Every structure is written in structure tokens, then in C-alpha cells.
Design a protein around this ligand. Structure first.
Ligand SMILES: *NNc1ccccc1
Ligand SMILES: *NNc1ccccc1
Lengths: 360, 109, 119, 360
């Protein structure tokens, strides 16, 4: 026999998911674990140094990571980077230099995104002053800071436009940025106040549709941003809660805690009872399934202590993640159906993502 | 009592308590560097019944302490209220940003 | 018994599998590779320790080369520490408390393989 | 108003401190040394040691020495093998000493990273995989000698009765002695006669080290000795650790840093387990046996607590044992060791603990 390398991932792309393991206990050795969701098999991994973030290119060919290195780890010069990795060989291809202020923090989707056209990577900076960083994928270059986003946080791509995105600002509104073909800001606009920052703070995780986004609040209200027109129209609140729900103090909780099934308009939300100040990151007692058109709950199922989720529009699936274990659900009908659980997929993950299929 | 996540001053700690890591609530363990910046929490003192401002400066430049991990979220808010937010590394602007542990520094009423 | 790819996956992924008799590390077959192939993006070691293992299925003894796969951080799955005929570092190529990735372009240890050499 | 300060020293006196070398094998790029107070189990601090670090404390008690490997981008880029000098009280980095890129990567046996008795030279094991011994001049901060004469040998046993002499175990079953000059270059050397049969009765590398002699135990429970009271080492053995009853139950040694010597009494401590056979030489201890090395007879046996490695403090008459995660503290002032306490969760994956030196 002869040992060989150079091999590709054994399962096809459409079987793959990415579990971003922060490994918080040893955060300098974070990594992405690649799994087959159809049978739970471990397929490989991508090392991501200190507090890595990850996304898959929209076209499905590459994995993008974002991380921080130092010449001697705990001393020496800092290098913040985006890395481009081949998705099938799980090999490093290119390093793109960032200014030394990429966001270091927990793995919310909105900290490391891309434009709908896949031409720009769009990431959150914090120095601790906030700005949005733009990376030109074709050039392998950092463009420049979107300074207009100071005092805002996170990136919500507009799926109905090639190079536009929004961010949530400290005034309770949204800032929309429209990039030119070079990745510089070509125009921008600012919505009216959507939510009261003081009285009804929202979770940053969007339930993202093609031309609107919904957001849930600490008190179980729902807010919407409609970006079908050239200017964003904001609305809300409406409540996730009926009287019974309210009497038992049900509120949302988690990290990447919501999802939208776009074809049906079903929104998925992690919820727990006995809500009060300080419970907004509590594990899911239940998953509620909301019809965003009728504004009524259509289903509620055990939460399996989940904290984060992701939705696949192309296969009608939902993944949930409790920090270590990944649950696979069929959401082709209003009530989700649990297919299997992948145990020990990570030590400390708050983010799972599918390998993209289709999506044009 | 200071090494428990339920100690009152730790009400917005997302991290390892420095008091379990060779430091104290207001001093970094040997060889770790204080962050000049921090998230801030307002915590209820169970003795006098008053709320106090606590500054959660991190200690930085050493790898994770790994002891007394806490994730308490009293009055914590998302990154659009950045200095109330504890899901970011408050070592982010240090000479070395590696996160070691979190302190709970009493500012005042 | 000589062809792990034709065997039960659960059998080859066990520390008790006959050819894993001097493995100290993570089995590559649990890490996205196989008994004789490195997981994607990890590189075989050109050097290794060698163990002698008895195959109970066919009654014969085989030379096994324990090459590592290298240049990726620890796989973390199917950790084994078997020591049949393993010897200390003064019999260096029989010794498994050293990183057999030590001479690779990148020495970070990912997982260990069990390659059948011959009788 | 409280103010957070750095710059502080370890809170307990040097004489209370122990060093648990945590390989963190599951995340081996984030190995570290944990510093504990053995009198009360308090965690005092830590030193990061990157990939597969090794550690020792300077004989004068003032500095901690680490040995490790870095790469520019951890899993890619240029390799840098180094020794680092750290202040023992401030647990701060002071100096990096460059090594050739062949320092031993392997489990934390004491004899892979040692120093001369006078403390002026660090003596370390290389493997490329060809073996040699590297010499670092502490004062100069330089790698000054590469002992190629030690090819085919392994590990470093310092001679406590000479200022700059050490021995290594060779493939012929004998010992090579190296005497360094005051410049750290080899000043002379010698080879003993065969001590043990490599094929028929291999020894564990860990010495039970006295001032002028060292004892070694074998895979089959025999004891060999090397007397270095003179310039030429005199070798002897075997004698058996075992009586007839012990042999009937197949008792043999097992572990890593598995032996120790109490120099004032001549008592040797050894981890043992029953039902020995080929492949059990690294099994956790069922018992600790206490041997009188003068009479060549056992004097006591106590439960082993699944320990794998130990170390002895002569002046306080202490033995530490370590099961990978927990450290047991024993008083050995009398022939039967007495358990004083256990420090739980001292490491995730350690095979080495050491006291802070108090001798000078
Ligand atoms: N509080 N310090 C912290 C929080 C989240 C990640 C890393 C560090
Ligand atoms: N078998 N490879 C290995 C063994 C011990 C440490 C690191 C790697």
C-alpha cells in the first residue's frame, strides 16, 4: 500500500455543511469542520487560527475564511486576513491582507458576508470604532473602509441587487450602502427609525427574504425592512406572542436565532419561557414557526437547546446547533420533521452553514 | 464567592473570570495586559439595592485561561450599542489581541 | 482482513483494529481520509515509525508503516494510544511518542495512517 | 473608583509553585504551562507555548525556559524553532533564542529539554529524524553546539555532581557521556560498556537520578544502574523489582516520567501494573512501589491513582503524581507515601509536572 494526499472531499458538494468551531477554550486553534448532513460523516476541516469566521463563495467553488495571526501568536506583528481555500481540495490558495481591525467576536452571520453578485466580500471592522470593510475578490485586494457605517453593526446583503447591503445603526434605523463596480461606495441612504433601541432592542440576525428582512426583538416583537424600492421602508412592531404566550413570558433567545423559508414565508425563531432581562442568549426551549403573511404561529416543536440555525431554500432544510451537536430538519411542511442529529460536530460552535446549491 | 458566575459584579461577563486565572477582579494575571477599552454593565448590588456601573476590561496577550467561564447578559445589548455588547473581544485594540480573561471593575453608582 | 476499504467502517475506525497496533494519534479514517489516504489538504509524512502487527483473521504477521498526515491542526477524532512492540527513542523508528510529521514542510500533526508494507 | 492594573507578580512564593506542562493534544498548537500552588491547589498563572511546547525552570529559580515551534501562518509558512526565556515571577517573555529547525517534537519526557547542573547551558534533544543534542548558552542567548556524536542516542540525563556534564542512552544499550567546556562546546566524551540489552530488556528512558548515579527500570521490571562518581561511567544490572508472587501476577512498570528517587534515603518510586505483557509499558499505575535501592528490595506499595508521570522534591520530601489531568501531592518523608491532596483539572493532557527549584 502507499499513502497519498491530494484527494478531494469524498461526498459531493450538495451533501456538505460547515460547522464553525470557535474552540473558545483554545481560541487560537479555531477551525471549520466539514460534515455530510445526509449521514453525519466527518469529511475534513479548514484551520482558522484565532477566532476564525467562515463563508462559502456564492458560486460554491471556494471557502472564504477571516482570521488573525501574530508573528509569535501572543506577541509580534498582527496580520488580519481573508483566506481563499479550494472547497473540494480543502487547500489554501490566497491570502488577502486586511487592516488590523477585523471584528474579533462570536460567529454571527452578518459579520462576514458577500454581495449578491459574489464580487465583494463585506466584513465588519472594529477598532473599536466601527466601519465596514470591502474586499475585491477578483483583485485579491482590500478596497477601503465604509466610514459611513460608523456607529452601526453587521451586514445584511440585499438579495435583489448585485452589490448592495444594509447595516443596523445606533439610531434604530438601517443604513443602505450601494457599491460601484470598484467596491467603493457609489451611494447610500438611511431609513426612518425602525425600532426603539432603548425600549425594544432587536437581535441582529435577519430573517432574510429576497426584498425584505424581518428582525425579532428582546421582547418578542417583529420588525421589517422592505427594500423592494430604492429606499427602505420600515415597519413594526407586531408580536410573536398570543395572550397565553405573554402570560408565561415567552421571548426569543439565541445567536443566529432566526431563519426564513422564502417560498412559504415561514419564519423560524428560537424561543424560551420565563423571559426577563438577561435571557436573550438562552438556549431554545422551542422552535416557533411563524407565517409572516398572516402574522400567526403555525407550529411549535422542542428546541433541543439550540442556539443557532440556518435554512436551505433549495432543499427545504433547517439546521440547528446547540454548540456541539447539529440537528437536521425537513421544513417542506409547516411542522418541521427531525431527520437526524450529528453529535460532537464541534466543541464551541455558534454557526453552521450549508454548501450552496444553485441560488442564482 | 468572587469566582462564581452568579457574583453580583459579574452580571455582563462573557469570558473567563480573571480571579480564577491568577489575577483578581481588578488585576490581570501575571503577564497579561489590561485592555484600555471595555464593555460596561450595570449590575444590581444585592446588599444596598443600588445599581452600579461595572467596566469589563479584558486581560490580553496570553492564550485562553479556560477557568470559570461565564456568559451572563444582564442589560447587555447588540453591537449597534457597542459598549454594552459582550460578544466581541474587548482585547481587539491591544498590542496583542489574544484573549486571556475578563475583569469586573467597579466604576461607581 | 488485508483491505480496509472493503471492511466494516466501524471495524477500521477502532483502536483495536489489528493493523493499528502501534498507533499514537488520531486515525485518519475518522478524519475524512482512509487508512491509506490523508484527509483533503493534509500531506503524508515521508518518514514514519514502523510497527509489527498480528492479523488474527489470516494468522500472519505484517509490517505496518505509521505515516502521519501533516500541515493541518489536530483532527481530534478516534484518538488511539496502542503500543505493541513499541520501543523508546533509542530505537527511533520503532518509537511513537514523537511527531512523525517532524520533517514535513509543515510539521503540524493532523492524523496517523496505518499502511501495510508486507509480511 | 477601581482601576485595573497589570505588571503583577505571581501571588505565592516560589517554593509553593509547580509547573504542569499541558500539551493540549486535541489542540496541540495551544499547548501551555499551568502554574499552581501545590499547598492549596490555587491556579497562579500560565505561560503559552504554541505547538507542542516543552518547559523547565532555571536551576537558580529566576527564569522559565520554554522550547517550541512557530510557523509564519501556523499550518504554513516558515518554521522557527526556539527557546524562550521568561521571567519566573512576572510570567513575561524576555528573550527568544533561535534553534535549527529540528528540535524534538514529541511527548514531554523530562530528558528532552534539560540544563547543565551549573545552569549555564540548556541541553535539548534534536530529531531530523537523525538525532543530535543541541546546546544553548543562556547568557549569550545563542545555540552554540550540536553534538553529532550522540547520533542514534536519545534523551539527556544531567550529572548532578559535575557542572556541565550529561549522559544519553544509545542504540548499543550503553551511555554516552558529554562534558561541555565553559564555552558550551564539547570538551570531552566517553562511552560506557553495554548496560542493557536493547532487544531483550529495553529500559524506560526516565532516570531515577541521584547525585552520582542513575537507575533505570525496564519493560520487564528489571533495574539497571549507571555510576558516574568517576569520569568513566560504570554500569550494572539487572536486579529485579519483582519477587515470586509479583511475577505470578505479571507485575511490570508502566508510564512516562515513571520513576523518581528520594536521594537522602535511596528510595526509588516506580509506577507498576499487573497483567503485564507486550504493549502495556505506558499503562496507568495500579500501584506505586517504593524500592530500597541499597537492599534491592521493595519496602512499600500504595494505590497508583492511575498516574502516568511523577516528580520528586528532595528538600520538602514531596512526590507529585499526574494522571494526565489531575495532580496528586504526596509526603514522602517516611517510607510509605501519604496523600495530602489532589488538584483536579490541572491540565487537559499533561504528561509532565515539575517543582519550582529551591536548591540553587
Ligand atoms: N469579554 N471578552 C470576550 C468576549 C467574547 C469573545 C472574546 C472575548
Ligand atoms: N504518531 N504521530 C504522533 C505521535 C505523537 C505526537 C504527535 C504525533
Amino acid at each position: 500500500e502507499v499513502l497519498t494526499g491530494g484527494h478531494s472531499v469524498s461526498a459531493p458538494q450538495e451533501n456538505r455543511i460547515y460547522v464553525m468551531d470557535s474552540v473558545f477554550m483554545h481560541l487560537t486553534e479555531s477551525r471549520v469542520h466539514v460534515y455530510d448532513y445526509t449521514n453525519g460523516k466527518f469529511l475534513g476541516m479548514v484551520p482558522t487560527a484565532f477566532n476564525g469566521h467562515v463563508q462559502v463563495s456564492n458560486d460554491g467553488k471556494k471557502i472564504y475564511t477571516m482570521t488573525t495571526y501574530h508573528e509569535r501568536i501572543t506577541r509580534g506583528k498582527r496580520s488580519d486576513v481573508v483566506e481563499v481555500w479550494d472547497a473540494d481540495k480543502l487547500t489554501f490558495e490566497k491570502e488577502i491582507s486586511l487592516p488590523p481591525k477585523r471584528v474579533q467576536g462570536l460567529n454571527y452571520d452578518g459579520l462576514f458576508r458577500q454581495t449578491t453578485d459574489g464580487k465583494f466580500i463585506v466584513l465588519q471592522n472594529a477598532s473599536p470604532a466601527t466601519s465596514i470593510g470591502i474586499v475585491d475578490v477578483a483583485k485579491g485586494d482590500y478596497v477601503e473602509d465604509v466610514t459611513a457605517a460608523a456607529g452601526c453593526w453587521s451586514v445584511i446583503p440585499q438579495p435583489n441587487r448585485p452589490r448592495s447591503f444594509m447595516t443596523i445603526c445606533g439610531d434604530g434605523g438601517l443604513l443602505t450602502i450601494n457599491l460601484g463596480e470598484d467596491g467603493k461606495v457609489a451611494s447610500q441612504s438611511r431609513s426612518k427609525q425602525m425600532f426603539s433601541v432603548k425600549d425594544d432592542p432587536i437581535f441582529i440576525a435577519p430573517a432574510l427574504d429576497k426584498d425584505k428582512a424581518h428582525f425579532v426583538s428582546y421582547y418578542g416583537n417583529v420588525y421589517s425592512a422592505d427594500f423592494s424600492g430604492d429606499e427602505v421602508k420600515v415597519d413594526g412592531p407586531w408580536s410573536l406572542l398570543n395572550d397565553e404566550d405573554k402570560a408565561k413570558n415567552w421571548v426569543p433567545g439565541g445567536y443566529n436565532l432566526v431563519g426564513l423559508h422564502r417560498a412559504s414565508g415561514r419564519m423560524y425563531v428560537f424561543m424560551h419561557p420565563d423571559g426577563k432581562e438577561g435571557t436573550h442568549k438562552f438556549p431554545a426551549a422551542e422552535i416557533w414557526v411563524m407565517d409572516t403573511k398572516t402574522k400567526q404561529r403555525v407550529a411549535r416543536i422542542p428546541g433541543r437547546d439550540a442556539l443557532s440555525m440556518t435554512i436551505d431554500q433549495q432543499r427545504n432544510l433547517m439546521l440547528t446547533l446547540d454548540g456541539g451537536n447539529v440537528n437536521v430538519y425537513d421544513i417542506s411542511q409547516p411542522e418541521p420533521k427531525l431527520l437526524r442529529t450529528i453529535e460532537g460536530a464541534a466543541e464551541a460552535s455558534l454557526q453552521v452553514q450549508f454548501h450552496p446549491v444553485g441560488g442564482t | 464567592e468572587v469566582n462564581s458566575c452568579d457574583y453580583w459584579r459579574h452580571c455582563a461577563v462573557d469570558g473567563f473570570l480573571c480571579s480564577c486565572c491568577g489575577g483578581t477582579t481588578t488585576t490581570c494575571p501575571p503577564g497579561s495586559t489590561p485592555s484600555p477599552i471595555s464593555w460596561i454593565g450595570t449590575c444590581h448590588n444585592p446588599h444596598d439595592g443600588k445599581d452600579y456601573l461595572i467596566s469589563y476590561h479584558d486581560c490580553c496577550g496570553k492564550t485562553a485561561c479556560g477557568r470559570c467561564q461565564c456568559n451572563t447578559q444582564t442589560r447587555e445589548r447588540p453591537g449597534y450599542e457597542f459598549f454594552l455588547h459582550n460578544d466581541v473581544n474587548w482585547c481587539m485594540a491591544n498590542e496583542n489581541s489574544t484573549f486571556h480573561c475578563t475583569t469586573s471593575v467597579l466604576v461607581g453608582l
